[PDB]
Amino acid sequence: NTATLILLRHGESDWNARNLFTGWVDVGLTDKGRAEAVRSGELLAEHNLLPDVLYTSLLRRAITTAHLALDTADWLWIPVRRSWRLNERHYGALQGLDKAVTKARYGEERFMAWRRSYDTPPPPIEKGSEFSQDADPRYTDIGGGPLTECLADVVTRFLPYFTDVIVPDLRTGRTVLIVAHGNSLRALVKHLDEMSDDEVVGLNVPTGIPLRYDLDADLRPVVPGGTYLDPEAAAAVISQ
Amino acid sequence: NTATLILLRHGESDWNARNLFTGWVDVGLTDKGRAEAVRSGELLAEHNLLPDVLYTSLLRRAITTAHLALDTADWLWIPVRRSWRLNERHYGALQGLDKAVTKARYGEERFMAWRRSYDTPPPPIEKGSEFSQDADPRYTDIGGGPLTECLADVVTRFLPYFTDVIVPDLRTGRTVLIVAHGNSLRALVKHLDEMSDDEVVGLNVPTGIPLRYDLDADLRPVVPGGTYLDPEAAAAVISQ
Ligand SMILES: [Cl-]
Ligand SMILES: [Cl-]
């Protein structure tokens, strides 16, 4: 390959454990999320796949995962860059709710529409409310950020980071590690495998298993959909 | 102040605990080193002194300290930049030795000369030996790096990072956190307080206590020698 691109989704958060919709709410990893981060570091070491640069979101669940993985692989010194553009989808007024409370507030029809739609965002979160990031200083330069997102939105706001920051790193032949979230990783994978809008909502991204893309001279993948560093553990997540 | 500059030396490593000369040998923190990192994070939070950018060395004992501190202060999202120029002094052929073995190999006179001299480096470490960094990939761009340093050397190789990378950040009014090592922090402090060669070898830098410099329009300090965020705990280290 001219270039290698490694994709890691973080493991379980406290709000995954409680079945709460997180979005941009900056929650921590559980112990089991941490153990997945250590494990993914072991997998990077076993395959001698040590990145020249790390990219993360601004959310502690990604950042901590990346740190734990690199610490386990004894590779903490590499450059790191972070952006909001790698954040999970903003879940709008669903941030901090669960299935039952969302269904009661908006009805079953809308809850089903938002869960599977590519184009339809949930309703905006209230400005200044407990789980809104609008006053958060990390988002000042984007006016506090969006008040809700669908996957389409995530793609629109991720693409510029990919073409302007990450693509140049990949062209230089460097091995790039991105540690981020389901929907932002979906945005990237959509672009690398030229997936359609429908194919991408249905895309499964297992947690804690780095996914290796080997890219050619045009930065198209040598193997469509990439190669998980533990293919058997990954078939396990997808099958369940 | 036009600008605030925060200085943190990392806490105890495994080789501090065993009284071994470390230099650029990339050793880990002890539990007590970790607890100092958490504590320094609490001190940054209590003083509401949250940095806009973090600078570290390439050594895991600094990097981990910085991560633990920012994690405790809930401030993990900030940009980070690292350089070898913030590394501890390279201890030459003393890397991995202790007082007794150095004295027996080189004599008491040289051991005393190297410990207190500004200008006299210890002897070079053997290339390819177990505690040499010359083959280490993080130092490829500098030819494997120096085979030994005195404090004078540290100043020569730190100054360019200060004037070219850190000074521009300080001019923009940003709060800068540097997490590094005794001798690299000594190089910086020498420059900020225009200390003489003699004054600086004798400079004490306590571990685990951030040191706040408030800089004026010329980037000269408002308070010479800075203000420790826990002045009483700091008088404790200096007095012992
Ligand atoms: Cl965490
Ligand atoms: Cl460590």
The secondary structure of B33-95 as a DSSP string is HHHHHHHHHHHHHHTT---SEEEE-SSHHHHHHHHHHHHHTT-TTS-EEE-GGGSPPP-GGGT
CB B87 within 8 A of CB B60: no
Question: Which has the closest alpha carbon to A61: A17, A85, A25, A97?
Answer: A25
| CB environment A176-214: b (16+ within 10 A), e (fewer) | bbbbbbbbbbbbbbbbbbebeeeebbebebbbbbbbbbe
In the structure encoding, which two tokens stand for residue B39, read together?
A: 């504590």
Tokens of A101: 């409370």
Contacts of residue A64 in chain B, CB cutoff 8 Å?
A: 71, 76
| Contact (CB, 8 A) for A212 and A229 | yes
Facing residue for B58 by CB, picked from A60, A74, A77: A77
| Alpha-carbon Rg for chain B in angstroms | 17
Q: How many C-beta atoms surround the C-beta of residue A31 within 10 A?
A: 10
Q: Which two tokens stand for residue A132?
A: 């809104």
Query: For chain B, what is the domain count?
Result: 1
A74, A76, A138 ranked by CB distance to B77: nearest:
A138
E-strand stretches of chain B: 3-9, 53-56, 80-82, 176-180, 211-215, 227-228
Which of A10, A36, A149, A181 is flagged as catalytic?
A10
Q: State CA B202 to chain mean position distance.
A: 15
Q: How far is CA B156 from CA A90, B89, B119, B132, B152, in A?
A: 48, 12, 11, 21, 6
Contacts with A59 from chain B: Cβ below 8 Å = 77
Ligand lying nearest the CA atom of residue A34? 1
C-beta separation of A39 from A210 below 8 A? no
Contact between A197 and A10 under an 8 Å Cβ cutoff? The reply is no
Return the H-helix or E-strand segment holding A112.
helix A108-116
A88 is catalytic: yes
Centre of ligand 1 from the C-alpha of residue A184, in Å: 19
Spot the catalytic one: B67, B88, B149, B181.
Answer: B88
A239 vs B1: CA distance, rounded Å? 59
Amino acid B213 reads Y
What percentage of chain B's residues is helix, strand, coil (to nearest 5)?
A: 45, 10, 45
- In angstroms, the CA B82 to CA B76 distance is 15
**Residue B194 one-letter amino acid:** E
Nearest CA in chain A to B55: A79
Contact A117, A149 (CB under 8 A): no
Distances in Å between the alpha carbon of A79 and those of A174, A233, B63, B82, B142?
Answer: 12, 29, 12, 7, 17
Distance of CA B90 to the CA centre of its chain: 12
CB < 8 Å to B74, chain A: 60
Ligand that lies nearest to the alpha carbon of residue A37, given by its number in the listed order: 1
Structural element, H or E, at residue A157: helix A151-161
Is residue B98 within 8 Å of B20, Cβ to Cβ?
A: yes
Q: Rounded distance, CA A4 to CA B121, Å?
A: 42
CA B190 to CA B172: how far, in whole Å?
A: 22
- Residue A124's SS3 state is coil
Nearest CA in chain A to B138: A77
Given the structure tokens 């600008």, which residue do they identify? Answer: B3
**From the candidates A76, A84, A133, which should be mutated to test the interface with B, based on the most B CB atoms within 10 A?**
A76
- The answer to whether A67 touches B128, Cβ cutoff 8 Å, is no
Ligand 1 centroid–CA A29 distance in Å is: 4
Ligand lying nearest the CA atom of residue A11: 1
Interacting residues of B36 by C-beta distance below 8 A, sequence separation 6+:
B10, B11, B12, B65, B207, B208
What's phi and psi for B154, nearest 5 deg? -65, -40
Q: Which residues, other chains included, contact B32 with Cβ-Cβ below 8 Å and sequence gap of 6+?
A: B11, B12
| Structure-token pair, residue A202 | 């249905």
Where residue A163 falls (left for φ over 0; alpha for ψ -120 to 50; beta otherwise) is alpha
Query: How far is the centre of ligand 2, averaged over its atoms, from the C-alpha of B61 (Å)?
Result: 5
- Contacts from A108-114 at CB under 8 Å and sequence distance 24+? A114/A150
* Cα dihedral B150, B166, B4, A64 sign: negative
| A71, A74, A80: residue with CB nearest B80 | A80
The C-alpha of A68 sits at a distance from chain B's nearest C-alpha, in angstroms, of 10
Phi, psi of B239, rounded to the nearest 5 degrees: -70, -25
The CATH number given to whatever domain includes residue B202 is 3.40.50.1240
The H or E element spanning position A9 is strand A3-9
Cβ(A202)–Cβ(A238) below 8 Å? no
What distance in Å separates the CA atoms of residue B210 and residue B179, rounded to the nearest whole number?
9
CB-based contact B120:B47 (threshold 8 Å): no
Tokens coding B225: 């020698």
Angle between the B99-106 and B108-116 helix axes, to the nearest 10 degrees? 120
Give the domain range for residue B188: 1-240
A64 C-alpha to ligand 1 centroid (Å): 5
What is the rounded distance in angstroms from the CA atom of residue A36 to the CA atom of residue A33? 5
Q: Are strands B53-56 and B176-180 parallel, antiparallel or unpaired?
A: parallel
Measured from the Cβ of residue A224, the count of other Cβ atoms closer than 10 Å reads 11
Cβ proximity of B55 and B171 under 8 Å: no
Give break positions in chain A: residue before each, C–N beyond 2.5 Å: none
- Burial class of residue A215 (count of CB atoms within 10 Å of its CB; 0-12, 13-18, 19+): buried
What CA–CA distance (Å, rounded) separates B85 from B159? Answer: 8
Neighbours of B219 (CB within 10 A): 17
Of residues A61, A71, A128, the one with CA closest to residue B60: A71
What size, in residues, is chain B?
Answer: 240
The Cα-based distances of B130 to A209, B25, B91, B134 in angstroms read 33, 10, 14, 10
Q: What is the CA(A49)–ligand 2 centre distance, in A?
A: 21
d(CA B101, CA B96): 10
CB A58, CB A33: distance < 8 Å: no
Beta bridge partners of B102: none
Answer for the pair B150, B118: CB distance below 8 angstroms, yes or no.
yes
Q: How far apart are alpha carbons A76 and A71 in whole angstroms?
A: 6
- Partner-chain contact B64 A71, CB within 8 Å: yes
CA nearest neighbour of A123 among A88, A92, A100 = A92
| Distance, CA of B120 to chain centre | 19
**CA distances for B25 relative to A74, B42, B91, angstroms:** 13, 28, 9
For residue B192, give the nearest of B211, B231, B220, B168 by alpha carbon: B220
A162 touches A185 (CB < 8 A): no
Look up residue B216 and give its DSSP letter: -
Contact B63, A77 (CB under 8 A): yes
Resolution value, angstrom units:
2.5
User: What CA–CA distance (Å, rounded) separates A98 from B169?
Assistant: 43
Q: How was this structure determined?
A: X-ray
Q: Phi-psi category of A72—alpha, beta or left, where left has phi over 0 and alpha has psi -120 to 50? A: alpha
Q: Which listed residue (A46, A47, A67, A88) is catalytic?
A: A88
- The DSSP call for residue A116 is H
